[PDB]
Design a protein around this ligand. Structure first.
Ligand SMILES: C[S@@+](CC[C@H](N)C(=O)[O-])C[C@H]1O[C@@H](n2cnc3c(N)ncnc32)[C@H](O)[C@@H]1O
Length: 229
């Protein structure tokens, strides 16, 4: 009997509980359940991924087509907070991948630094994502930008980081809480405005979705970055 199967997305597993392979067996990050499966000499541990805490988990359970975060990927994560979702991104990309965890709160930054002591593939970048010139010497070109900064100017922030760091043909995944971007606009008006702005920066959405029943008026937009020469 197989208990934990690979998900459609490489590096994600499904146990309906979503889980990732724990890069640091024995350690939990935010109190999540861990499931360790031993058979003979083999052993693998997974970590439960809470879709009421992690917008990316809610999107995956909501049926997103691609997430682009995969084993070996280099990810620029904007708005890393204390590392809840970053820890699962770190699990997915694995030892040969890389996650830059950009977060400007020093309080949250201390949690990220402690998390990255055990995870070799996390670089805490405790800086303001509006000013990538201050950290551009730390960020090698990346494959994916994941953004969840919950700011009215999030699209401009993401575009500036994309134009600096994202490879041609790389991808983006942007989390959008409508009332964090413009609380006097309707969710549809916010999401349409943000999609429009992305397209103008050669961030072409390939999929957009909302996150019910985990979150209300909260979208995830996934797409590809195809800038001019
Ligand atoms: C919704 S929380 C992120 C939750 C996190 N993505 C997760 O799922 O684990 C938004 C975060 O973005 C951070 N943030 C907001 N504006 C920022 C900026 N200009 N630069 C860096 N971090 C920023 C906030 O401090 C906060 O930690």
């Amino acid at each position: 009997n197989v208990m934990v199967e690979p998900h459609r997305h490489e590096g994600v597993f499904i146990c309906d509980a979503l889980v990732t392979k724990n890069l640091v067996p024995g350690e939990s990050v935010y109190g999540e359940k861990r499931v360790s499966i031993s058979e003979g000499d083999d052993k693998i541990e997974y970590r439960a991924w809470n879709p009421f805490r992690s917008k990316l988990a809610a999107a995956i359970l909501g049926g997103v087509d691609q997430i682009h975060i995969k084993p070996g990927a280099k990810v620029l994560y904007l708005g890393a907070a204390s590392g809840t979702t970053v820890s699962h991104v770190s699990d997915i990309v694995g030892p040969d991948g890389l996650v830059y965890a950009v977060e400007f709160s020093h309080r949250s930054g201390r949690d990220l630094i402690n998390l990255a002591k055990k995870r070799t593939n996390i670089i805490p970048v405790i800086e303001d994502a509006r000013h990538p010139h201050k950290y551009r010497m730390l960020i090698a070109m990346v494959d994916v930008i994941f953004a969840d900064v919950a700011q009215p100017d999030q699209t401009r922030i993401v575009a500036l980081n994309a134009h600096t760091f994202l490879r041609n043909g790389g991808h983006f995944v942007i989390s959008i809480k409508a009332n964090c971007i413009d609380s006097t606009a309707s969710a549809e008006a916010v999401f349409a405005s943000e999609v429009k702005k992305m397209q103008q920066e050669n961030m072409k959405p390939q999929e957009q979705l909302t996150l019910e029943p985990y979150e209300r008026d909260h979208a995830v937009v996934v797409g590809v970055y195809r800038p001019p020469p």
